[PDB]
Design a protein around this nucleic acid. Structure first.
Ligand SMILES: Cc1cn([C@H]2C[C@H](O)[C@@H](COP(=O)(O)OP(=O)(O)OP(=O)(O)O)O2)c(=O)[nH]c1=O
Ligand SMILES: [Ca+2]
Ligand SMILES: [Ca+2]
Ligand SMILES: [Ca+2]
Ligand SMILES: [Ca+2]
Ligand SMILES: [Ca+2]
Length: 900
DNA sequence: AAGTAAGCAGTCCGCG
DNA sequence: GCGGACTGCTTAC
C-alpha cells in the first residue's frame, strides 16, 4: 500500500515522523531534513523556480532548519523578502508525500479516554493536580477495547472491585446498564495504589501510543491533569513519556484567579471532541456537558446518581466506574453519528497538514495552496504584517414587516466561492484597477463597461482571463467534493420522506429492513417493497436514512465552511494571501449580484403579470431573494387546485421552467457586463411556502432583517410528508431563549402560518394559564458569562453590570463559604432567572451553571422567589407581540358586537 | 481556530 | 417610557 504519515514534528534540527509503511506497519523515524527557501534573483540567471508573479528565484538549500530560520531573520534585518514555506514540517510532508494521500483509518490508533478524580474541596485544578487519579477508561480503536484502570485504595477511601456482572444489569435490577454491545470489550484492571496504576498506564501508553487522542474536554482537563499528576509523583521525565518523542510544551493562557494551561504532547494529534463538536456541528447549545450533548445527539437519558460527584466513589464505586466507562462510550456513539474524526482525517490528509490543524482554515489553505504551487515549481510569498482594517460585506434588503402568503425563495450555490471562480480572484491574477462608479450604476446597468480586456468586480479590481488563479483552482476542487456529499445528503433526505409516507400504512407482518444504500434515490423496486413493510422495519429504515443524512451533512457542510473560510481568510491579516482588494472584490460583487438579480426578477414578473413598478422580491440577504407568489396563484385561482400538493407542484414547475431560466439570462448578461472569466452564478429555487390549501393559515411573515418564518412544503427538491417551518432569527432559534419558551413560540408560529388567528388565540390563552407549572430549568434564560471579575465590586454589581453577570454575583454571595457548591466558570454558560421584589437573595436575578440543577442549598428558595410574571413578559409575550403585529394578527381576542 | 451585517436585552441617561 | 449611545450576546449570511 501507499505510505502515509500519522504525525510530524520539528524538534531542533530533526523532523520526527510517525507513519504507516508500505506493509501497513506503524514506524517512527528521525530525519535531519534540509529545508529550502528562496530569494529573488537577476533575470539573466537560469532557474526553474518563479514566484507567483513570474519573478525568477534561486533556491537556498540549508545545512539544517535552524540555519534556515536564522537566514529568515537576517533577510528581515537586510529588508528583503525571504520566500518559501517557513513551516518546515509542511515542506517535509510535501517532499515526502508527493502524491494524493490514500489513508487507511484502520491503521490509525484513535484513542478516546476519560479520567476520574475525587475532590472534597471543589474543582480539581489540572495545573495543581493535588488529588489522586482514581479511574481511567481508555478506549483503543485498533484493539476495539475499553481499558479500565481502577484505583481501589486512596486517601479518600478504600473500595471493592467493580463488578462487570452488576454493570451489565438493568437499573431496575440495581445494575448500571452498561450497554451489552460493549460488555465483552472491557478489560478491567484494579490497582492497590495510585503509583502502580499510573506506571502501568504509561507502560500501556508506550505499547499503544495514540495517534489521534480524543474524548470530552481532554485538552483542558484530562491531559493536563494526568500530565501534572505524574509530574508531581514521579518527576518531569516520566510525565514526558506521554509524548512518543519525550517532548512536551506547556502553554498557559490563564485567567487571574485560576491558573490553567494546555500541554502540547509532541507526536500526538489531540482532537478534543468538545472542540470538534463546536467547530463541525453547527449547533449552539445551552450547555456543553457530556450528559447534555449526549441527550441531544443520541436521545439517551442522564446518568443519574445520588449525592455530589465528590462522594460518588466512596458511596457507590460500582456506579462510579460504570459511569466512567459509559462516558467514554457516549463520545464514540456521538462520533459514529456525526463522523467528525473521519472528517478531520479526510481534510488533514487532503491538505497535508498535522491533523489537529483542521481547526485552522488559514493553516489548511496555506498548505493546500503551497502544495498546489510547488507542483509547478512556483514559490510562495513571505507572510507580512498588516494592521487590522474593517471592510464592507453583504447587502441585506429592508423588508416591509407583514404576513406573506405564498413565497418562493432562490439563492446562489456556494455564493462567495462561485464569485471567486467566476471573477478569477487570486493573489497572482490581479491585472489592475478601473475607475469605479457608484454601485447603483452597475446594479442598473448604466455605468460604462469596466473593461474589454479583464474580468471585473464593481469594487474596481480587474483580473487576468488567460488562466485560472491558484485560489479559483483549489477552491473548485473542494467545492466539487462538497457538491458530491450534498448530493448524498439530499438523496438520504428524500429517501427519509418516502419512509415517513409509507409509515402511514404499516403492514402487520414480521419482516426485515431492506439492505439499501440511502445515499441514492430509492428505485421503484425498493419503493414497492417499502409499502409492504411493518412499522418496526420502516422505523429502523427511517433511522438508517436519517443517520446517512447526518453523515452527508457533516461531509458537505464542513467542506462548504472550508471554502467560505478561504473567501474570509482573504480578509484576515494572518493569512499569507491577505489582500483587502480581493476580499472586497468578492463582497462588492455579491452586493451587485443580489441587487442586479432583484431588478431582473421584478422586471420579469411585472412583464408576466402585465404590471409596472410592482415589487415581487420582498426580501433578500447576501445571495438570496424571496419572491411573493400570490399573484401567480391568483392568476390560476385557488379553487382550481385539488389539494396543497397540487399548487406546490405548480409553483415548483413555474420556478424551474420560467423563473430559473429568466434568472440565468439576467446573470449571463451581468457576467458579460463585468467581462468575467466564466458564468457561475447559479440561483436555484430553495423553498416553496404557503398555507395549507383551504385553511386560515397566513403562510409566512417577516418582522425585519434576518427575522422571518415560512411554512415550507418543498426544500431544495425535498417534498415533505408534513409541512416544515423555516424560522430564521426569531426567538425559537436562539440558544438564550428558554427551552419551553422556544417550544411555545414555535407552536404559536405553527398555528399562525398553518391554522390562523383563532387557533393562535386558543393556544396563547392556554399557555399563559399553565406556564407556572413548567420546570424551572425549562423556563430559565441562557447566556455566556464573560468578564465576571470586571463587573464584580466587593461581591456587588459594578457600573454597567450586565443582567446575567448580576445574576452570577447574586449566586456567588448566596453560596459563599462553600467549597462544594459548583462555581460559575468564566466564559461558560449560565441559566438565568428573575427574582421577585424583597427576596432573600437581595437582587433582581440569579444565575447558575447551565446544564445543571441549582445546588440544593438554594434550590427551594429560588423556586419560591422565581418571578414568573417577568419571565412570561420578557421571553414569551414580548417576542410574540413582535410576531403578531408584524403579521397583523392579535394573540388575544378583541371585543366585538357579538358579545351582546 | 476565515469574514461582515444586524437583530434584541439591558444599562445609563436624556427628554422641559 | 422611549430612543440613542454603548456593551454584550447571538444569529443570518
Ligand atoms: C454560512 C456562511 C455564509 N457565508 C457567506 C459566504 C456564502 O457563500 C454566502 C451565502 O451563504 P449561504 O447561502 O449560507 O451558503 P453558500 O451560498 O456558500 O452555499 P449553499 O450552496 O449551501 O447556499 O454568505 C460566510 O462567509 N460564512 C458562513 O459561515
Ligand atoms: Ca466523570
Ligand atoms: Ca447560497
Ligand atoms: Ca404498507
Ligand atoms: Ca442564502
Ligand atoms: Ca441551492
Amino acid at each position: 500500500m501507499k505510505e502515509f504519515y500519522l504525525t510530524v514534528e520539528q524538534i531542533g534540527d530533526s523532523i520526527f515522523e510517525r507513519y504507516i509503511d508500505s506493509n501497513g506497519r506503524e514506524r517512527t523515524r528521525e530525519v535531519e531534513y534540509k529545508p529550502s527557501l528562496f530569494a529573488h534573483c537577476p533575470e539573466s540567471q537560469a532557474t526553474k523556480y518563479f514566484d507567483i508573479y513570474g519573478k525568477p528565484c534561486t533556491r537556498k538549500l540549508f545545512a539544517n532548519m535552524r540555519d534556515a530560520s536564522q537566514w529568515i531573520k537576517r533577510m528581515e534585518d537586510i529588508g528583503l523578502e525571504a520566500l518559501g514555506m517557513d513551516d518546515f514540517k509542511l515542506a517535509y510532508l510535501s517532499d515526502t508525500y508527493n502524491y494524493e494521500i490514500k489513508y487507511d483509518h484502520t491503521k490509525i490508533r484513535v484513542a478516546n479516554f476519560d479520567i476520574e478524580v475525587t475532590s472534597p474541596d471543589g474543582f480539581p485544578e489540572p495545573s495543581q493536580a493535588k488529588h489522586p487519579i482514581d479511574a481511567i477508561t481508555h478506549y483503543d480503536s485498533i484493539d476495539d477495547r475499553f481499558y479500565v484502570f481502577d484505583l481501589l485504595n486512596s486517601p479518600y477511601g478504600n473500595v471493592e472491585e467493580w463488578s462487570i456482572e452488576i454493570a451489565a444489569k438493568l437499573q431496575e435490577q440495581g445494575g448500571d446498564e452498561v450497554p451489552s454491545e460493549i460488555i465483552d470489550k472491557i478489560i478491567y484492571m484494579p490497582f492497590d495504589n495510585e503509583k502502580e496504576l499510573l506506571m502501568e498506564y504509561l507502560n500501556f501508553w508506550q505499547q499503544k501510543t495514540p495517534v489521534i487522542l480524543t474524548g470530552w474536554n481532554v485538552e483542558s482537563f484530562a491531559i493536563p491533569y494526568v500530565y501534572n499528576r505524574i509530574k508531581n509523583i514521579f518527576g518531569e521525565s516520566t510525565a514526558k513519556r506521554l509524548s512518543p518523542h519525550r517532548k512536551t510544551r506547556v502553554k498557559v493562557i490563564e485567567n487571574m484567579y485560576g491558573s490553567r494551561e494546555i500541554i502540547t504532547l509532541f507526536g500526538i494529534s489531540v482532537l478534543d471532541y468538545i472542540d470538534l463538536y463546536k467547530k463541525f456541528s453547527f449547533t449552539n447549545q445551552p450547555s456543553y456537558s457530556l450528559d447534555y450533548i449526549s441527550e441531544f445527539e443520541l436521545n439517551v437519558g442522564k446518568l443519574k446518581y445520588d449525592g455530589p460527584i465528590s462522594k460518588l466513589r466512596e458511596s457507590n464505586h460500582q456506579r462510579y466506574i460504570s459511569y466512567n466507562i459509559i462516558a467514554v462510550y457516549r463520545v464514540l456513539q456521538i462520533d459514529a453519528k456525526r463522523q467528525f474524526i473521519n472528517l478531520s482525517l479526510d481534510m488533514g490528509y487532503y491538505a497535508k497538514i498535522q491533523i489537529q490543524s483542521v481547526f485552522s482554515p488559514i493553516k489548511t489553505w496555506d498548505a493546500i495552496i503551497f502544495n498546489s504551487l510547488k507542483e509547478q515549481n512556483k514559490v510562495i510569498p513571505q507572510g507580512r504584517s498588516h494592521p487590522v482594517q474593517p471592510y464592507p460585506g453583504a447587502f441585506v434588503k429592508e423588508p416591509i414587516p407583514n404576513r406573506y402568503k405564498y413565497v418562493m425563495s432562490f439563492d446562489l450555490t456556494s455564493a462567495y466561492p462561485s464569485i471567486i471562480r467566476q471573477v478569477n480572484i487570486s493573489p497572482e491574477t490581479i491585472a489592475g484597477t478601473f475607475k469605479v462608479a457608484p454601485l447603483h450604476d452597475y446594479i442598473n446597468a448604466v455605468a460604462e463597461r469596466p473593461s474589454d480586456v479583464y474580468s471585473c468586480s464593481p469594487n474596481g479590481m480587474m483580473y487576468y482571463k488567460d488562466r485560472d488563479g491558484v485560489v479559483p483552482t483549489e477552491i473548485t476542487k473542494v467545492f466539487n467534493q462538497r457538491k458530491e456529499h450534498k448530493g448524498y445528503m439530499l438523496a438520504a433526505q428524500r429517501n427519509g420522506e418516502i419512509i415517513k409516507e409509507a409509515l402511514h400504512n404499516p403492514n402487520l407482518s414480521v419482516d426485515e429492513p431492506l439492505d439499501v444504500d440511502y445515499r441514492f434515490d430509492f428505485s421503484d423496486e425498493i419503493k414497492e417493497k417499502i409499502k409492504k413493510l411493518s412499522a418496526k422495519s420502516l422505523n429502523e429504515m427511517l433511522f438508517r436514512a436519517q443517520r446517512t443524512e447526518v453523515a452527508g451533512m457533516t461531509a458537505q457542510i464542513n467542506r462548504k465552511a472550508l471554502i467560505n473560510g478561504l473567501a474570509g481568510a482573504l480578509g484576515n491579516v494572518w493569512f499569507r494571501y491577505y489582500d483587502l482588494r480581493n476580499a472586497t472584490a468578492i463582497t462588492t460583487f455579491g452586493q451587485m449580484a443580489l441587487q442586479w438579480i432583484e431588478r431582473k426578477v421584478n422586471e420579469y414578473l411585472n412583464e408576466v403579470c402585465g404590471t409596472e413598478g410592482e415589487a415581487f422580491v420582498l426580501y433578500g440577504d447576501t445571495d438570496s431573494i424571496y419572491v411573493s407568489a400570490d399573484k401567480i396563484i391568483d392568476k390560476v385561482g385557488e379553487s382550481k387546485f385539488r389539494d396543497t400538493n397540487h399548487w406546490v407542484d405548480f409553483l415548483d414547475k413555474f420556478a424551474r421552467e420560467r423563473m430559473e431560466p429568466a434568472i440565468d439570462r439576467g446573470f449571463r448578461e451581468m457576467c458579460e457586463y463585468m467581462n468575467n472569466k466564466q458564468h457561475l452564478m447559479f440561483m436555484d429555487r430553495e423553498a416553496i411556502a404557503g398555507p395549507p390549501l383551504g385553511s386560515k393559515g397566513i403562510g409566512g411573515f417577516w418582522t425585519g432583517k434576518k427575522r422571518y418564518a415560512l411554512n415550507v412544503w418543498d426544500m431544495e427538491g425535498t417534498r415533505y410528508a408534513e409541512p416544515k417551518l423555516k424560522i430564521m432569527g426569531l426567538e425559537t432559534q436562539k440558544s438564550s431563549t428558554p427551552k419551553a419558551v422556544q417550544k411555545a413560540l414555535k407552536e404559536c408560529i405553527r398555528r399562525m402560518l398553518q391554522e390562523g388567528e383563532e387557533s393562535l388565540q386558543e393556544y396563547f390563552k392556554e399557555f399563559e394559564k399553565e406556564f407556572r407549572q413548567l420546570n424551572y430549568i425549562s423556563i430559565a434564560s441562557v447566556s455566556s458569562a464573560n468578564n465576571i471579575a470586571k463587573y464584580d465590586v466587593g461581591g456587588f454589581p459594578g457600573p454597567k453590570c450586565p443582567f446575567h453577570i448580576r445574576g452570577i454575583l447574586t449566586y456567588n454571595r448566596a453560596i459563599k463559604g462553600n467549597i462544594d457548591a459548583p462555581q460559575v466558570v468564566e466564559g461558560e454558560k449560565v441559566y438565568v432567572l428573575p427574582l421577585r421584589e424583597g427576596n432573600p437573595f437581595g437582587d433582581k436575578c440569579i444565575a447558575w451553571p447551565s446544564g445543571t440543577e441549582i445546588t440544593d442549598l438554594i434550590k427551594d428558595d429560588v423556586l419560591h422567589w422565581m418571578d414568573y410574571t417577568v419571565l412570561l413578559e420578557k421571553t414569551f409575550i414580548k417576542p410574540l407581540e413582535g410576531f403578531t403585529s408584524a403579521a397583523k394578527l392579535d394573540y388575544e381576542k378583541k371585543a366585538s358586537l357579538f358579545d351582546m
